[PDB]
Amino acid sequence: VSTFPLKSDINITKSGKTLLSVGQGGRSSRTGFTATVFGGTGFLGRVVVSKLAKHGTNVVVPFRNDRARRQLKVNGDLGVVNFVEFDIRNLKSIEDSVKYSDIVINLIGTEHFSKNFSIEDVNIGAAERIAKAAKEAGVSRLIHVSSYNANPSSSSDFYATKGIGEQVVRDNFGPDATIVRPAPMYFRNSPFLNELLQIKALGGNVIFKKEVYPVHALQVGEAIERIAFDDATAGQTYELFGKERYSKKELREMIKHIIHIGQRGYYPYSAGFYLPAPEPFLYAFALIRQYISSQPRFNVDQLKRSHINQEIDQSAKTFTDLGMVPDELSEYLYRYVKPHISYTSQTQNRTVYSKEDIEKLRDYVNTP
């Protein structure tokens, strides 16, 4: 956020351009930069595009969904946000997105596969194509966002493709490409917290045992802003994670009390809060819905990843290398699960869980 995201009013890109900034940093100001955010209509793109457009950075947002892009225009002043209809199977549209940008941010990536795109097409084929198209267009900075457990030799088809995608981005764009490895991100409408906030979660006895180091999505969006506007971060890999380690079983049980579903001794068990299932059934059901359901459900690869915990690459850089302190999930967990609290609505008295109260609740959850 801040009031002006730059250390100076003059910035010479590594491509040779000199970009001046005007204004004090409001909506009417400009930074002189043109950025392209691939995957801007997604969960993280809306955070990133909003932070760039609010300070006057011209953002090119290539879209495939016409309805999802409309809310992005509100973030910036007139002419700041620009849309290009595109497809990763179309090369002319990809070049048009990066033709004028000085920064290219790649947020395109899926944990699923569909009738049209496999995990290899998106996490590798798209990332490689975008990196090469960026280089031929003279883009000074490339930022590629992989996952937290990226590994070219992983048993998970998502972790493997994310790890290989890191390699191909550097092999095309060159050694100066920056790589970000966010942990599971929590925010409003967060894919990480949405599965924990769902009631009828089938096979949670297997799925919810994975441990992670969740990180605030606003900080990940803030960190990417720091990286793009500081050329000392080129060629670097950043592992953005929170200080504390949680298992999805803990958060699932901590959320239950905040939602007050446990007010009744019978209701959570009757409503389907716990849905134990043998892993072969979880495999078959995930496999079956992969060719019957039209919406991306819990697939086979996510079942495998439920066993693999998050491993922090120690050779990579952290939030402290960017001069930022990670946020604590304890200080943000309530306000992001607040919409899901059942009665609330100033009935008698709200139970606002402070940061101290969340940690007290965590011990009670872990007490048998």
Partner 1 sequence: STKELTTARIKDISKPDENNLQQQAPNRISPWSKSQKPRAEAQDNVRFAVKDLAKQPRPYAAIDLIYKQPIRYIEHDNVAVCDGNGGAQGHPKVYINLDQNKAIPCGYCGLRFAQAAFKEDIES
Partner 2 sequence: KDFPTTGYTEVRYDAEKRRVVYEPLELTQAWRNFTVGSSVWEQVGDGKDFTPESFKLPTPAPDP
Partner 3 sequence: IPRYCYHEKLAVAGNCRMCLVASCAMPVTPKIKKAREGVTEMLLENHPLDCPVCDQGGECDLQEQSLRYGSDRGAVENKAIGPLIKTSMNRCIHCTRCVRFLNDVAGANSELSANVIDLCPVGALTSKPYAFRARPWELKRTETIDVHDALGSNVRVDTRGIEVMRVLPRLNDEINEEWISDKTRFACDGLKTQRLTKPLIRQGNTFVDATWEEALATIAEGFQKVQPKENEIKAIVGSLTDLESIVALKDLVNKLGSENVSTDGDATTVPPAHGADFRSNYIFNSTIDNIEEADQILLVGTNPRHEAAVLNARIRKVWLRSDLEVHHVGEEFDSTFELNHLGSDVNALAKALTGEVGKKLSEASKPLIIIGSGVTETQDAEAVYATVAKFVTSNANIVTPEWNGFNLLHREASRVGALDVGFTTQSPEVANTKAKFIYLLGADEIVNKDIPKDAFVVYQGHHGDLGASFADVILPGSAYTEKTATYVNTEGRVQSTRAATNPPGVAREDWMIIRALSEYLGATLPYDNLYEMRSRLADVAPHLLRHEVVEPVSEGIAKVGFQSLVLLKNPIENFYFTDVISKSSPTMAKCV
Q: Which amino acid is at 196?
A: L
CB count within 10 Å of CB 111 equals 21
| Contact range with ligand PLC by CB under 6 A, out of 30-38, 68-76, 285-293, 309-317 | 285-293
Instruction: Decide if 318 contacts 239 (C-beta within 8 A).
Output: yes
Check binding of 297 to ligand PLC (CB under 6 A).
yes
* Residue for token pair 């998970």: 156
Check binding of 75 to partner 2 (CB under 8 A).
yes
Helix (H) / strand (E) element for 281: namely: helix 279-289
Q: Which does 7 bind (CB under 5 to 8 A by kind): ligand NDP, partner 1, partner 3, none?
A: partner 3
C-alpha to C-alpha distance for 355 and 358, rounded to whole angstroms: 5
Interface with partner 3 (CB under 8 A), residue from 1, 2, 5, 10: 10
Q: How far is the CB of 16 from partner 3 (least distance, A)?
A: 9
Interaction pattern, residues 32-71, with partner 1; x per rule: CB under 8 A: --x-----------------------x-x-----------
C-alpha to C-alpha distance for 350 and 343, rounded to whole angstroms: 9
Q: How far is the CB of 105 from partner 3 (least distance, A)?
A: 23
Q: Which token pair is 99?
A: 């033709």
Helix (H) / strand (E) element for 60: namely: strand 58-63
Cross-strand bridge partners of residue 65: none
Interface with partner 3 (CB under 8 A), residue from 2, 14, 15, 20: 20
User: Alpha carbon of 54 to those of 21, 80, 189, 229: distances in Å?
Assistant: 14, 9, 21, 15
Footprint of ligand NDP (CB under 6 A): 39, 41-45, 64-65, 68, 88, 107-110, 117, 122, 145, 147-148, 182, 184-185, 191-192
Q: Tell how strand 34-38 and strand 18-20 pair up.
A: unpaired
Q: Which is nearer to ligand NDP, 107 or 133 (CB)?
A: 107
Check binding of 191 to ligand PLC (CB under 6 A).
no
- 275: which DSSP letter? B
* Residue for token pair 């596969």: 113
Q: Which is nearer to ligand NDP, 32 or 42 (CB)?
A: 42
Check binding of 348 to ligand PLC (CB under 6 A).
no
Q: Which residues in this chain contact partner 3 in the complex, by CB under 8 A?
A: 7-12, 18, 20
Query: Interface residues with partner 2 (CB under 8 A)?
Result: 1, 23-24, 26-29, 46-47, 50-51, 71, 74-75, 77-78, 188, 218, 221
